[PDB]
Amino acid sequence: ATFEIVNRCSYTVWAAASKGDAALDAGGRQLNSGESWTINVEPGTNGGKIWARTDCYFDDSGSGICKTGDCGGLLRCKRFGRPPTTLAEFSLNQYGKDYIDISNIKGFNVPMNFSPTTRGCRGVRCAADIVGQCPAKLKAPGGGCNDACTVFQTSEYCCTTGKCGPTEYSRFFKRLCPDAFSYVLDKPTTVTCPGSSNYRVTFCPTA
């Protein structure tokens, strides 16, 4: 599948794409304002994620730090990133269908649009000003708005028992972006698309 990653933000992001134990395509790249990066995602990939990282510094060997979404200090991510990170999530060619979602379960850093470019399903978006409205306890000094699992490390926020309900914190993310996961057992906002669809992820889709 082909994913075109678009940075429409006014600031530079460092895009990332990994399936947790490996990179997708090169794994990461700088995207200045307006740049587009096109990657290929091997068919059948299940549990892939794409995110933005902000405020990064990398040396000439691709080693460094980002303030949000750092993946162990590497430009080219192998693993998932440190919260807060707004996530686009996908599983490809699963019994003939592709599965796509946006999640705030690991917090929010950059607004995002995840839209099929091919025919047969709809996109989803989380575009609100979550960082500006973030409750003070969930604010990340680095930037972003953490999820309450990250911050408070409880069974209820982390949904450790497989039974958990919505919270004052989940409902905050849900009120601002109903079309994204807000906690692990939220009613699904997964979109089912035709198998072997191609995609666009747009950072800061509205500004």
CA torsion sign, 169 to 157 to 91 to 77?
Answer: positive
- Please provide residue 157's backbone torsions phi and psi, each rounded to the nearest 5 degrees: -75, -40
- Please provide residue 118's backbone torsions phi and psi, each rounded to the nearest 5 degrees: -95, 180
Tokens 């003939």 belong to: 96
What is the rounded CA–CA span in Å between residue 106 and residue 83?
5
What is the rounded CA–CA span in Å between residue 93 and residue 109?
29
What is the rounded CA–CA span in Å between residue 132 and residue 62?
31
Cis before 111? omega within 30: no
What is the rounded CA–CA span in Å between residue 174 and residue 171?
5
- Count of C-beta atoms within a 10 Å radius of residue 115: 16
12-50 burial by CB neighbour count: b if 16+ within 10 A, else e?
Answer: bbbbbbbbeeebbbebbbebeeeeebebebeeebeebbb
- Please provide residue 24's backbone torsions phi and psi, each rounded to the nearest 5 degrees: -105, 125
Q: Tell me the two tokens of residue 86.
A: 């707004």
* 3 state DSSP class of 155: helix
Q: Give alpha helix (H) positions in 58-160.
A: 130-133, 148-152, 155-158
Half-sphere exposure of 143 (CA within 13 A, CB side): 15
What is the rounded CA–CA span in Å between residue 147 and residue 108?
8
Q: Tell me the two tokens of residue 180.
A: 């994204």
What is the rounded CA–CA span in Å between residue 188 and residue 102?
10
Q: What is the topology classification, in CATH, of domain 1-207?
A: Thaumatin (2.60.110)
- Answer whether 194's CB lies under 8 Å from 120's CB: yes
Element (H, E) at 169: helix 168-176
